[PDB]
Amino acid sequence: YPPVRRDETVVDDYFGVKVADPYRWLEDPNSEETKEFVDNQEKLANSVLEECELIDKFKQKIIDFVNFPRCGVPFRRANKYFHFYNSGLQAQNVFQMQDDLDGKPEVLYDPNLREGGRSGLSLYSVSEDAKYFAFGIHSGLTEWVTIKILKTEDRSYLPDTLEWVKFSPAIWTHDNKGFFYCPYPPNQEARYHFLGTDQSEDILLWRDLENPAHHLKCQITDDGKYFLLYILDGCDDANKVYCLDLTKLPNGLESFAPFMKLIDSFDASYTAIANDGSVFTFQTNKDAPRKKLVRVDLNNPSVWTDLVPESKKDLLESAHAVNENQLILRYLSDVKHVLEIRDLESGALQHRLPIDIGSVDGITARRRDSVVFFKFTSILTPGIVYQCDLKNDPTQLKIFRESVVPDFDRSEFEVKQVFVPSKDGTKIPIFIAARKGISLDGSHPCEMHGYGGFGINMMPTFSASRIVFLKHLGGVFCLANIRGGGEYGEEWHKAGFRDKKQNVFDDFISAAEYLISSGYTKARRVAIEGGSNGGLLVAACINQRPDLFGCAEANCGVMDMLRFHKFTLGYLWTGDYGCSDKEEEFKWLIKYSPIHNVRRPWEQPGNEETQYPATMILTADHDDRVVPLHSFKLLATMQHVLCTSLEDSPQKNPIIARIQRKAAHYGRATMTQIAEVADRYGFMAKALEAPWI
Amino acid sequence: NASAPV
Ligand SMILES: C[As](C)(=O)[O-]
């Protein structure tokens, strides 16, 4: 282990509790001492990884399994269709256009020609007349985007260059004169940009200097009549709704704004699904933690009526107006999708299609489209684009595109869903994937994934690397739908946040206990993996029950729960986590903060045989979302407490960081991501003493 | 818009 300096003078008082921070100096990513740490850890990592002789076998198998063409879900503008394509191994997906769904594609924008495809497209917007394509380009490693506009007819750029954007969409008016977007000043704003003008001329529609942390999303209705502005605070599923009637402006957007403030609190979520003139259909969680559809007339805005009442059991995850007078509702029913077709006007059910284990997403059809397309994936189904022609054949899903994994016979494997009790009795759904016919004799290596926060739904989607694990390591994979997610509505989220964050960890630990008791695996043959809030999941669980796990892989985790709120966008997570500035919330946080709860398990009576799992801490060197000090401080703390603070420690399992050079949080070019995942699985196979098959 | 299901 490399020498890592401790600054024994750094100590802080939290409400009478003294907390030492000997690796505070790792918070400065620019010092030579920090850069030397990174160099030293990289060297150590490389030295451990070169002992992991299956990395190259995993890598090539992952490459081979990923090497298949993928056509994304198409969407329509005017007569043209647009979609993403990848021939299999391109660094990023290429944006294509066609005149006909089965006609020859033209390339509209290829991210691979820029910076070797470090980053793909995240902002992509096509104008209503299909003549213009607005998209976001990253300049360097930062999160800042520049919006450029290309003409679809000849692929020439407009001069227009819009700076100081991050995650804004570009929302076009039906007159094709320009678009709404939400930039920051050189305090997010809502602006309108006219084509052929400099950004300095853009019309200001909204700012709130009195609430600088409030952030914005926007939308235009399918009829082109209303601009909707949504105002959000932090990460809560709740928002304001402001409506601007574009038909009543004396001189268009040039006239400048006078929003109708339909909803002006943060009490509930509201997404506009459809309107007929002033009569709006919303999706909302108001008095409905599993969501519902409601109707309100802007001309009588006090009076809301249920259109599709809240299900007693199932989350209404999304809703989409289609074929002029219908709705497709996407329900999540015990973490499996159910698609319903309903009448828009009455809300009446017409058809109901339960979906197999997997996930349907990517419905982009608009009210005026009669063909709806969507994507289905699952652990054992790489990717199908389905089409449903509501005009001519409403009852049938037809396969439009079907991905094929080379040399993968899905019939050798099986996926099941089971429900397991947490400490408090609560039923936790888990998916379990494995070779068919295995013996439940405790002998299989097992990988478990989870997240558990922020109302995020964890779906069992396709992963090529997971198939390598299953087939070539004889592995058992588990995806655990722990609390803190949104899978059973807002009550599931809140049963796993703030003072109840510990429930999330208990759920995950309860799942691992089930997999051991049921005979899939055994204590110390279980690997756990998670990212971001899921990286926190991994780090807390290994601190609390190191005896259960043989390998832990924490991707860009939030590890200093006392100081996270002080860096970049960490302040937006206090909704889920609390904040150590407030004593009560400090008292939740200090009990599970990963860098504050590293302890030698062998010093606990009865626990003399126990060490920490083999641990890989992963992070990009320029993650501006979750700053890498989290990872670095946890690494330093573990290495110290468990290894270099002792002459001949019992901690034999390696503790290392895989630090990606010249990487942001976003990017993930194919080969870069494959390299990372190959390293994570080779390490796991070595940690669990699992042979290649 | 992930480039591949890795
Ligand atoms: C990016 As996060 C800390 O909400 O998982």
XYZ file of C-alpha atoms and ligand atoms in Angstrom:
704
model
C 0.000 0.000 0.000
C 1.324 3.457 -0.838
C 2.042 5.951 1.927
C -0.858 8.351 2.411
C -0.367 11.337 4.616
C -2.652 11.959 7.596
C -3.198 15.502 8.739
C -3.888 14.867 12.427
C -4.737 18.495 13.124
C -8.045 18.604 11.163
C -11.005 18.289 13.568
C -14.526 19.702 13.475
C -17.193 20.051 16.086
C -20.666 18.945 15.096
C -23.020 19.935 17.922
C -20.503 18.702 20.546
C -19.343 15.675 18.570
C -15.687 15.864 17.512
C -15.070 14.494 14.031
C -11.459 14.212 12.768
C -10.797 14.516 9.002
C -7.173 13.448 8.447
C -7.625 13.272 4.619
C -9.277 16.712 4.231
C -6.369 17.566 1.887
C -7.806 15.093 -0.686
C -10.684 17.564 -1.196
C -8.315 19.679 -3.359
C -8.143 17.867 -6.704
C -5.383 20.181 -8.013
C -2.555 19.766 -5.407
C 0.488 17.755 -6.274
C -0.138 15.728 -3.137
C -3.613 14.729 -4.362
C -2.284 14.027 -7.860
C 0.465 11.880 -6.292
C -2.234 9.996 -4.337
C -4.071 9.310 -7.577
C -0.858 8.247 -9.303
C -0.030 5.970 -6.351
C -3.489 4.387 -6.191
C -3.506 3.889 -9.947
C -0.189 2.106 -9.629
C -1.513 -0.072 -6.816
C -4.726 -0.801 -8.726
C -2.847 -1.776 -11.833
C -0.662 -4.083 -9.760
C -3.731 -5.825 -8.285
C -5.583 -5.930 -11.573
C -2.614 -7.558 -13.343
C -3.087 -10.498 -10.879
C -6.694 -10.761 -12.138
C -6.130 -13.001 -15.031
C -9.682 -13.130 -16.324
C -9.970 -9.415 -17.123
C -8.936 -10.066 -20.727
C -11.354 -12.989 -21.060
C -14.235 -10.869 -19.706
C -13.253 -7.962 -21.978
C -13.329 -9.948 -25.184
C -16.492 -11.770 -24.329
C -18.178 -8.411 -23.528
C -16.978 -6.926 -26.809
C -18.294 -9.955 -28.693
C -21.667 -9.893 -27.016
C -22.102 -6.074 -27.536
C -21.200 -6.335 -31.271
C -24.660 -6.150 -32.833
C -26.458 -3.349 -34.629
C -28.931 -1.314 -32.562
C -31.690 0.887 -34.043
C -33.325 3.118 -31.437
C -37.054 4.028 -31.243
C -37.951 6.291 -34.183
C -39.908 9.488 -33.883
C -41.699 11.522 -36.465
C -41.561 15.191 -37.512
C -43.508 16.212 -40.570
C -42.897 13.318 -43.057
C -39.478 12.339 -41.730
C -38.379 9.781 -39.117
C -35.436 10.188 -36.769
C -33.541 7.751 -34.632
C -30.254 6.708 -33.094
C -28.127 3.991 -34.635
C -24.979 2.049 -33.639
C -23.406 -0.581 -35.886
C -22.421 -2.385 -32.604
C -19.064 -1.018 -31.458
C -19.168 2.681 -32.284
C -18.093 4.845 -29.407
C -21.465 6.688 -29.432
C -24.814 6.350 -31.271
C -25.290 8.220 -34.531
C -28.384 10.352 -35.127
C -30.060 9.434 -38.418
C -33.024 10.610 -40.507
C -35.108 8.880 -43.131
C -38.069 9.584 -45.387
C -39.468 6.160 -44.832
C -39.222 3.839 -41.842
C -37.565 1.097 -43.959
C -35.820 3.493 -46.366
C -32.161 4.400 -46.563
C -30.936 6.369 -43.514
C -28.951 9.547 -43.771
C -26.534 10.567 -41.053
C -27.557 13.861 -39.519
C -24.988 14.020 -36.690
C -22.110 11.629 -35.777
C -20.639 12.293 -32.306
C -17.803 9.910 -32.993
C -16.107 12.518 -35.216
C -15.686 14.796 -32.224
C -13.169 14.043 -29.431
C -13.174 10.414 -30.554
C -16.790 10.124 -29.302
C -15.951 10.773 -25.621
C -19.531 11.968 -25.259
C -22.727 11.244 -27.185
C -25.821 13.367 -27.720
C -27.910 14.228 -24.702
C -29.742 17.227 -26.271
C -31.338 16.454 -29.558
C -34.413 18.298 -30.791
C -35.992 18.438 -34.267
C -38.238 21.242 -35.387
C -41.904 20.614 -36.196
C -41.305 20.991 -39.933
C -38.248 18.580 -39.770
C -36.015 21.266 -41.263
C -33.841 21.962 -38.222
C -31.945 19.912 -35.664
C -30.797 21.591 -32.406
C -28.292 19.656 -30.299
C -25.824 20.011 -27.491
C -22.045 19.694 -27.748
C -19.753 19.432 -24.722
C -16.628 21.658 -25.087
C -14.334 19.919 -22.649
C -14.829 17.719 -19.578
C -17.273 20.088 -17.833
C -21.054 19.718 -17.776
C -21.554 22.923 -19.904
C -23.111 22.484 -23.334
C -23.226 24.612 -26.449
C -26.372 24.354 -28.572
C -25.834 24.351 -32.374
C -28.449 24.060 -35.051
C -28.070 22.167 -38.292
C -30.318 22.240 -41.397
C -31.537 18.738 -42.133
C -31.731 19.400 -45.942
C -27.930 19.699 -46.440
C -26.379 19.192 -42.978
C -25.107 22.796 -42.876
C -24.830 24.677 -39.597
C -26.644 27.856 -38.782
C -24.394 30.502 -37.245
C -26.477 30.523 -34.044
C -24.388 29.394 -31.004
C -26.083 29.217 -27.604
C -23.813 28.948 -24.593
C -24.342 28.393 -20.820
C -26.720 25.466 -21.156
C -26.676 22.224 -19.142
C -29.671 19.826 -19.302
C -32.209 22.075 -21.020
C -34.309 20.756 -23.863
C -34.976 22.907 -26.923
C -38.678 23.225 -27.303
C -39.876 24.395 -30.693
C -42.866 26.505 -31.539
C -45.126 25.227 -34.269
C -44.304 28.288 -36.428
C -40.700 26.901 -36.659
C -39.330 30.391 -35.816
C -37.388 29.239 -32.786
C -37.434 27.470 -29.461
C -37.638 27.767 -25.712
C -34.618 26.692 -23.679
C -33.319 27.183 -20.138
C -29.819 28.581 -19.877
C -27.861 29.977 -16.977
C -26.373 33.489 -16.782
C -22.718 34.071 -17.887
C -30.326 31.456 -11.308
C -31.626 29.426 -14.250
C -33.726 31.295 -16.816
C -36.393 30.418 -19.386
C -35.547 32.027 -22.722
C -36.865 32.039 -26.239
C -34.356 31.928 -29.114
C -35.277 33.081 -32.613
C -33.444 31.285 -35.485
C -30.923 33.503 -37.269
C -30.189 35.714 -34.214
C -27.362 36.004 -31.619
C -28.029 34.593 -28.157
C -27.825 38.224 -26.766
C -31.156 38.831 -28.485
C -33.006 35.938 -26.789
C -36.289 36.885 -25.016
C -36.372 36.435 -21.227
C -39.618 34.682 -20.134
C -38.742 33.800 -16.487
C -36.084 34.183 -13.764
C -36.455 34.284 -9.933
C -33.456 36.009 -8.349
C -35.186 35.595 -4.954
C -35.018 31.782 -5.308
C -31.735 31.091 -7.080
C -31.838 27.308 -6.444
C -35.224 26.736 -8.144
C -34.732 24.956 -11.459
C -36.754 24.644 -14.656
C -38.260 22.280 -17.209
C -40.572 23.189 -20.059
C -42.953 21.936 -22.708
C -45.231 23.086 -25.455
C -48.639 21.546 -25.998
C -49.259 19.288 -29.051
C -51.507 21.900 -30.627
C -48.734 24.517 -30.305
C -50.987 26.869 -28.296
C -49.436 26.835 -24.806
C -46.002 27.098 -23.374
C -45.736 25.331 -20.030
C -43.034 26.158 -17.527
C -42.338 23.811 -14.639
C -40.503 25.025 -11.599
C -38.808 22.562 -9.287
C -36.915 22.669 -5.987
C -34.168 20.123 -5.300
C -34.838 16.516 -6.250
C -38.393 16.146 -4.894
C -41.157 14.826 -7.278
C -43.122 18.043 -7.104
C -43.424 21.135 -9.226
C -45.111 24.349 -10.087
C -47.034 24.739 -13.386
C -47.092 28.052 -15.187
C -49.039 28.320 -18.462
C -48.574 30.908 -21.239
C -51.173 31.140 -23.990
C -49.200 31.811 -27.184
C -52.360 32.542 -29.147
C -53.100 35.733 -27.119
C -49.862 37.620 -27.587
C -50.374 40.854 -29.539
C -47.069 40.352 -31.360
C -45.883 36.759 -30.749
C -42.910 36.235 -28.445
C -41.531 39.533 -29.737
C -44.296 41.059 -27.580
C -41.691 40.811 -24.737
C -43.965 37.235 -18.958
C -47.724 36.993 -17.961
C -47.973 33.362 -16.897
C -51.200 31.895 -15.624
C -49.875 30.369 -12.396
C -52.032 27.238 -12.373
C -49.945 25.590 -9.586
C -47.722 27.852 -7.463
C -46.550 25.553 -4.693
C -44.293 22.506 -4.358
C -46.951 20.231 -2.906
C -47.284 17.732 -5.790
C -46.029 16.663 -9.229
C -47.813 17.689 -12.363
C -47.107 16.684 -15.931
C -49.347 17.854 -18.756
C -50.446 14.917 -20.930
C -53.034 16.525 -23.216
C -55.341 19.431 -23.753
C -58.376 20.322 -25.768
C -58.290 24.155 -25.836
C -58.204 25.300 -22.232
C -59.165 21.822 -20.838
C -56.016 20.036 -19.607
C -55.241 16.461 -18.606
C -52.416 16.096 -16.069
C -50.570 13.236 -14.436
C -50.152 14.022 -10.712
C -49.235 12.556 -7.317
C -51.545 15.063 -5.484
C -53.242 12.979 -2.765
C -52.154 10.011 -4.868
C -48.761 8.520 -4.064
C -49.228 5.944 -6.843
C -50.200 8.797 -9.276
C -53.328 9.379 -11.283
C -54.748 11.393 -14.211
C -56.807 14.560 -13.485
C -58.533 17.241 -15.610
C -58.790 20.976 -15.074
C -60.022 23.856 -17.227
C -57.546 26.725 -17.155
C -60.580 29.086 -17.333
C -61.842 27.512 -14.079
C -58.578 26.572 -12.393
C -59.782 25.838 -8.851
C -61.713 22.770 -9.956
C -59.839 19.538 -10.610
C -61.524 16.215 -11.456
C -60.132 12.643 -11.520
C -60.008 11.175 -14.979
C -58.145 7.953 -14.139
C -58.240 7.391 -10.427
C -55.168 6.250 -8.449
C -54.738 2.453 -8.398
C -54.875 0.903 -4.987
C -51.752 -1.137 -5.975
C -49.918 0.053 -9.090
C -47.830 3.143 -9.900
C -48.981 5.055 -12.972
C -45.457 5.681 -14.119
C -46.227 7.551 -17.382
C -49.031 8.505 -19.730
C -49.109 9.410 -23.402
C -51.764 10.851 -25.650
C -51.809 9.133 -29.009
C -53.896 8.544 -32.135
C -55.904 11.780 -31.596
C -58.242 10.419 -28.944
C -56.420 7.728 -26.917
C -54.033 7.398 -23.994
C -51.360 4.787 -23.387
C -50.776 4.422 -19.672
C -47.575 2.666 -18.494
C -48.228 1.094 -15.122
C -45.579 -0.482 -12.892
C -47.127 -3.508 -11.198
C -44.753 -5.276 -8.797
C -41.897 -3.896 -10.826
C -43.164 -5.137 -14.149
C -44.784 -2.953 -16.784
C -48.430 -3.055 -17.824
C -49.535 -1.008 -20.807
C -53.161 0.126 -21.011
C -54.927 1.764 -23.923
C -57.733 4.113 -22.778
C -60.178 6.655 -24.215
C -58.737 10.176 -23.688
C -62.055 11.890 -23.171
C -63.744 9.426 -20.770
C -60.680 7.781 -19.293
C -62.294 4.374 -20.041
C -60.162 1.289 -20.350
C -60.061 -0.192 -23.841
C -57.163 -2.776 -23.700
C -54.638 -4.035 -21.267
C -51.260 -5.593 -22.106
C -49.168 -7.011 -19.178
C -45.486 -7.062 -20.064
C -42.987 -9.819 -19.273
C -40.101 -9.308 -16.794
C -38.106 -6.452 -18.321
C -38.835 -2.815 -19.108
C -40.770 -0.832 -21.671
C -39.662 2.722 -22.214
C -39.030 5.348 -24.841
C -42.616 6.163 -25.928
C -42.145 9.426 -27.877
C -45.277 9.264 -30.083
C -47.387 12.404 -30.052
C -51.110 12.883 -30.011
C -51.169 13.306 -33.732
C -49.283 10.022 -34.428
C -51.282 6.843 -35.057
C -48.273 4.454 -34.828
C -46.772 4.175 -31.363
C -43.237 2.772 -30.958
C -41.432 1.694 -27.843
C -38.444 -0.227 -26.628
C -38.520 -3.452 -24.618
C -35.416 -4.925 -22.907
C -34.817 -7.526 -20.263
C -32.014 -9.418 -18.607
C -32.287 -12.048 -21.359
C -33.724 -9.804 -24.200
C -31.225 -7.343 -25.667
C -33.641 -4.908 -27.221
C -36.811 -4.944 -29.287
C -38.539 -1.917 -30.837
C -42.211 -2.697 -30.962
C -44.781 -0.941 -33.033
C -48.551 -0.629 -32.434
C -50.592 0.827 -35.248
C -53.576 2.188 -33.411
C -55.402 3.122 -36.609
C -55.192 -0.160 -38.578
C -54.302 -2.884 -36.034
C -54.742 -1.631 -32.458
C -54.658 -4.957 -30.580
C -51.293 -6.231 -31.869
C -47.714 -5.390 -30.912
C -45.510 -6.026 -33.928
C -41.705 -6.427 -33.883
C -40.250 -3.461 -35.732
C -36.524 -4.037 -34.929
C -34.999 -6.922 -32.901
C -31.472 -6.919 -31.493
C -29.589 -10.201 -31.656
C -26.666 -11.021 -29.306
C -24.153 -13.171 -31.267
C -23.704 -16.695 -29.782
C -26.234 -16.161 -26.947
C -28.865 -18.794 -26.357
C -31.306 -17.294 -23.939
C -32.999 -20.617 -23.360
C -30.066 -21.762 -21.197
C -30.933 -19.121 -18.542
C -33.940 -18.053 -16.488
C -35.109 -15.025 -14.540
C -37.576 -15.122 -11.699
C -39.038 -12.575 -9.310
C -39.411 -13.399 -5.592
C -40.308 -11.357 -2.499
C -38.301 -11.430 0.647
C -38.875 -9.945 4.133
C -36.863 -7.016 5.346
C -36.105 -6.534 9.092
C -39.496 -4.821 9.596
C -41.409 -7.489 7.611
C -41.816 -5.369 4.520
C -41.837 -7.367 1.273
C -38.856 -6.508 -0.921
C -39.113 -7.628 -4.554
C -35.996 -9.094 -6.095
C -35.113 -10.446 -9.538
C -32.811 -13.481 -9.705
C -31.085 -14.590 -12.940
C -29.059 -17.754 -13.468
C -28.370 -20.741 -15.622
C -31.373 -23.081 -15.728
C -31.315 -26.094 -13.424
C -28.571 -25.011 -10.992
C -28.368 -26.654 -7.582
C -29.129 -24.432 -4.635
C -26.160 -25.805 -2.785
C -24.618 -22.509 -1.705
C -21.695 -22.736 -4.176
C -22.403 -20.014 -6.800
C -20.836 -16.652 -6.968
C -23.514 -13.986 -6.689
C -23.674 -10.367 -7.801
C -26.348 -8.104 -6.352
C -27.255 -4.637 -7.600
C -29.352 -1.905 -6.032
C -29.795 1.889 -5.699
C -32.547 2.780 -3.190
C -33.321 6.523 -3.348
C -34.707 9.523 -5.200
C -37.912 7.760 -6.381
C -35.820 5.898 -9.010
C -37.295 2.636 -10.350
C -34.675 -0.144 -10.824
C -35.669 -2.205 -13.838
C -34.201 -5.566 -15.049
C -32.798 -4.394 -18.362
C -30.266 -5.987 -20.740
C -26.556 -6.036 -19.878
C -24.040 -7.915 -22.050
C -21.506 -8.123 -19.253
C -24.106 -9.678 -16.939
C -24.547 -12.500 -19.490
C -20.758 -13.124 -19.361
C -21.078 -13.348 -15.572
C -23.942 -15.801 -15.829
C -22.479 -17.975 -18.602
C -18.709 -17.824 -18.060
C -18.548 -17.497 -14.313
C -21.613 -19.613 -13.462
C -22.917 -16.553 -11.583
C -26.243 -15.720 -9.944
C -27.395 -12.121 -10.531
C -29.839 -10.309 -8.297
C -31.480 -6.919 -8.711
C -33.044 -5.770 -5.480
C -35.981 -3.268 -5.463
C -35.328 -1.731 -2.109
C -37.130 1.184 -0.496
C -36.104 4.719 -1.349
C -37.029 3.901 -4.967
C -40.368 4.751 -6.514
C -41.504 1.253 -7.360
C -44.572 1.267 -5.056
C -45.160 5.008 -5.150
C -44.131 7.945 -3.041
C -44.624 5.975 0.193
C -41.894 3.516 -0.990
C -39.578 6.485 -1.602
C -40.216 8.085 1.756
C -39.855 4.771 3.648
C -36.274 4.926 2.435
C -35.210 8.550 2.863
C -34.109 11.058 5.570
C -34.495 9.515 9.081
C -35.461 6.208 7.310
C -32.501 5.960 4.997
C -31.252 3.055 7.143
C -34.267 1.001 5.904
C -32.678 0.990 2.453
C -29.560 -0.680 3.769
C -31.555 -3.154 5.873
C -33.562 -4.108 2.740
C -30.415 -4.795 0.772
C -28.851 -6.733 3.606
C -32.130 -8.710 3.905
C -31.946 -9.667 0.237
C -28.375 -10.980 0.616
C -29.496 -13.000 3.654
C -32.252 -14.561 1.531
C -29.881 -15.491 -1.270
C -27.651 -17.224 1.332
C -30.524 -18.995 3.190
C -32.131 -20.156 -0.057
C -28.921 -21.721 -1.210
C -27.974 -19.599 -4.233
C -24.729 -18.499 -2.654
C -22.936 -18.146 0.671
C -21.619 -15.455 2.952
C -18.368 -14.091 1.372
C -19.329 -15.337 -2.135
C -21.662 -12.317 -2.597
C -20.592 -9.274 -4.553
C -22.473 -6.049 -4.322
C -22.392 -3.152 -6.820
C -23.988 0.222 -7.089
C -23.453 3.788 -8.404
C -23.848 7.271 -6.962
C -26.539 6.942 -4.280
C -26.010 3.230 -5.016
C -22.312 3.657 -4.241
C -23.370 4.913 -0.807
C -25.578 1.802 -0.565
C -22.517 -0.425 -1.151
C -20.250 1.482 1.284
C -22.775 1.574 4.139
C -23.611 -2.091 3.719
C -20.003 -3.178 3.844
C -19.354 -1.107 6.942
C -22.462 -2.591 8.634
C -22.237 -6.243 7.536
C -18.784 -6.945 6.091
C -19.315 -10.569 7.022
C -21.924 -11.051 4.305
C -19.825 -9.869 1.323
C -16.784 -11.171 -0.646
C -16.531 -8.244 -3.061
C -17.807 -4.680 -3.092
C -17.789 -2.277 -6.105
C -18.855 1.272 -5.422
C -19.138 3.566 -8.401
C -18.811 7.276 -7.755
C -20.464 6.984 -4.372
C -21.481 9.671 -1.916
C -19.112 8.709 0.925
C -18.765 11.767 3.271
C -22.353 12.326 4.230
C -21.270 15.133 6.545
C -19.734 17.314 3.822
C -21.493 16.219 0.512
C -23.812 19.223 0.549
C -20.725 21.587 0.226
C -19.604 20.475 -3.257
C -21.055 21.170 -6.738
C -24.616 19.884 -6.912
C -24.584 18.032 -3.562
C -26.928 20.674 -2.161
C -29.816 19.284 -4.267
C -29.734 15.855 -2.360
C -30.581 17.198 1.080
C -34.215 16.425 0.253
C -33.377 12.707 0.405
C -30.462 12.729 2.855
C -30.838 15.630 5.233
C -27.948 17.963 6.009
C -25.273 17.956 8.756
C -25.855 21.688 9.329
C -28.937 20.684 11.287
C -28.392 18.679 14.500
C -31.285 16.249 14.112
C -30.219 15.360 10.584
C -26.529 15.177 11.587
C -27.703 12.495 14.019
C -29.119 10.326 11.105
C -26.094 10.970 8.935
C -23.267 10.168 11.341
C -24.628 6.673 11.917
C -24.195 5.558 8.293
C -21.727 8.053 6.646
C -19.316 5.702 5.021
C -15.996 7.493 5.806
C -17.047 7.787 9.453
C -17.944 4.136 9.959
C -14.992 2.181 8.846
C -14.170 -0.194 11.762
C -12.091 -3.313 12.124
C -14.651 -6.097 12.215
C -12.211 -8.562 13.825
C -12.105 -6.440 16.999
C -15.777 -7.195 17.683
C -16.335 -10.128 20.061
C -17.408 -13.219 18.137
C -16.341 -11.594 14.858
C -12.605 -12.448 14.884
C -12.734 -14.291 11.507
C -14.245 -11.385 9.593
C -12.567 -8.930 7.213
C -13.903 -6.380 4.689
C -14.668 -7.717 1.287
C -12.205 -7.053 -1.591
C -13.278 -3.538 -2.423
C -12.981 -1.544 -5.695
C -13.900 2.050 -5.398
C -14.512 3.492 -8.964
C -14.639 7.106 -10.032
C -13.952 9.431 -13.041
C -11.195 11.915 -12.214
C -13.500 14.881 -13.240
C -16.897 13.796 -11.943
C -18.555 17.160 -11.281
C -21.823 15.564 -10.120
C -20.369 13.385 -7.345
C -16.940 14.885 -6.603
C -14.177 12.274 -6.382
C -12.953 13.391 -2.974
C -15.774 11.028 -1.742
C -14.138 8.046 -3.236
C -10.591 9.186 -2.342
C -11.330 9.856 1.312
C -13.114 6.521 1.678
C -10.198 4.733 0.044
C -7.676 6.467 2.374
C -9.778 5.758 5.450
C -10.274 2.076 4.638
C -6.622 1.546 3.773
C -5.562 3.134 7.005
C -8.045 1.634 9.465
C -7.820 -1.813 7.999
C -4.316 -2.152 6.563
C -1.486 0.406 7.106
C -2.389 1.326 10.709
C -1.348 -2.266 11.682
C 1.888 -4.229 11.408
C 0.400 -7.450 9.976
C -3.309 -6.843 9.468
C -5.867 -9.670 9.115
C -7.241 -7.613 6.149
C -5.933 -9.603 3.236
C -8.677 -8.738 0.693
C -7.446 -5.832 -1.447
C -8.832 -2.361 -1.130
C -8.190 -0.323 -4.366
C -9.623 2.505 -6.513
C -10.095 2.355 -10.265
C -9.735 5.943 -11.251
C -10.681 6.813 -14.800
C -8.392 9.489 -16.276
C -9.856 12.382 -18.324
C -13.475 11.434 -17.659
C -16.572 13.296 -16.550
C -19.644 11.678 -14.938
C -21.281 11.625 -18.393
C -19.680 10.191 -21.452
C -19.227 6.474 -21.404
C -17.893 5.710 -24.900
C -18.413 2.025 -25.655
C -14.810 0.895 -25.207
C -14.223 3.064 -22.148
C -17.277 1.583 -20.469
C -16.307 -1.969 -21.569
C -12.807 -1.515 -20.083
C -14.252 -0.438 -16.757
C -16.729 -3.315 -16.550
C -14.092 -5.854 -17.591
C -11.877 -4.695 -14.744
C -14.815 -4.806 -12.277
C -15.718 -8.388 -13.218
C -12.100 -9.706 -13.354
C -11.576 -8.290 -9.881
C -14.824 -9.844 -8.689
C -13.903 -13.257 -10.068
C -10.568 -13.089 -8.223
C -12.209 -11.801 -5.032
C -14.781 -14.619 -5.039
C -12.251 -17.288 -6.141
C -14.497 -18.109 -9.071
C -13.098 -20.020 -12.063
C -13.871 -19.256 -15.706
C -16.146 -21.696 -17.508
C -28.765 7.589 -24.839
C -26.149 5.008 -23.826
C -23.934 3.850 -26.704
C -24.244 0.186 -25.764
C -25.934 -2.118 -23.121
C -22.666 -2.963 -21.415
C -26.592 11.532 -8.621
As -27.453 10.780 -7.054
C -26.365 11.229 -5.452
O -28.983 11.469 -6.901
O -27.535 9.004 -7.132
